[PDB]
């Protein structure tokens, strides 16, 4: 007795485009592949896919992978759930252009997985049952990168350039449990037109919480991500990137971020989060305000 499922998927506008989407479904217990589907947009670029799939009922693990080169071919070498999990765990080198931007034809890798979903009997090919992953209405894809958003609220006349340093070389389609093994060279951020906003992107990067700025065991402070501001005077400022919700201990971002206080930050950069800096460039110093939010 079958199930017809209506799958609605979307990213959680080059940053939002989903050019291809693979769905692979496995029996949660046996690991058998029980359904798969591939979608692509000839163009110009959609952010959502809606489609119907037929499968047998039971307990199912759903895997969604977007914007992976030749994912359709890859699906044939994913025979069972064990293969599928290995595939999700691969360290993949981020396309060089993606530290700067997604493009019209090359979107950010995205994924999502939902385990042990109860798929019940029913639906028809014309009237399918809506797929409700973990009770939600939509499949919500997570980008594998974070967005770095640097805004010069004052003193942009003094700015020569901004670079993202120690970015992870690799992304992973499921969250990282270990620090990066390899690091990308410096990325000069891209100015949004003639505004005072600079952008870049980088893969998720785990940093052990036993480390802090100036105490990583590494002269370059790897694996801590930071951005470097260079002024026309040739002054340089390094701003470590952290993940911190709520009020900053001591009220000043830089001393906290630089590991100068008893409380140390988390330096992990998480996928699909938005790191926003508001910077004032004064003659002899900078001031930095910070927030982290969803993308």
Numbering used by the authors: 34 to 45, 59 to 341
Which lines from the publication concern this structure?
The precursor form (pMfa3), but not the mature form of Mfa3, exhibited a high level of expression, could be readily purified and was used for crystallization screening. The pMfa3 construct encompassing residues 23–446 was however recalcitrant to crystallization. Instead, in situ limited proteolysis with α-chymotrypsin yielded rod-like crystals with a maximum diffraction limit of approximately 1.9 Å resolution. The asymmetric unit contained two identical molecules of which the 105 C-terminal residues were truncated due to the protease treatment. The refined Mfa3 model includes residues 33–341 and represents a two-domain protein with an elongated shape, 75 × 35 × 30 Å, similarly to Mfa1 and Mfa2. In Mfa3 the corresponding residues are Leu38, Val40 and Ala42, immediately followed by Arg43, the recognition site for RgpA/B cleavage. The amino acid that is recognized by RgpA/B for cleavage of Mfa3 is Arg4312; it is located at the end of the β1-strand and not exposed on the loop. Similar to the shaft proteins, Mfa3 has a tryptophan, Trp341, located in a pocket formed between the N- and C-domains. As in Mfa1, the tryptophan forms a π-cation stacking with an arginine, Arg189, which is locked in position by Asp62 from the β1β2-loop.
The resulting mature protein thereby has an empty position in the first β-sheet that a β-strand donated from another fimbrial protein presumably fills in order to polymerize the individual proteins into a polymeric fimbria.
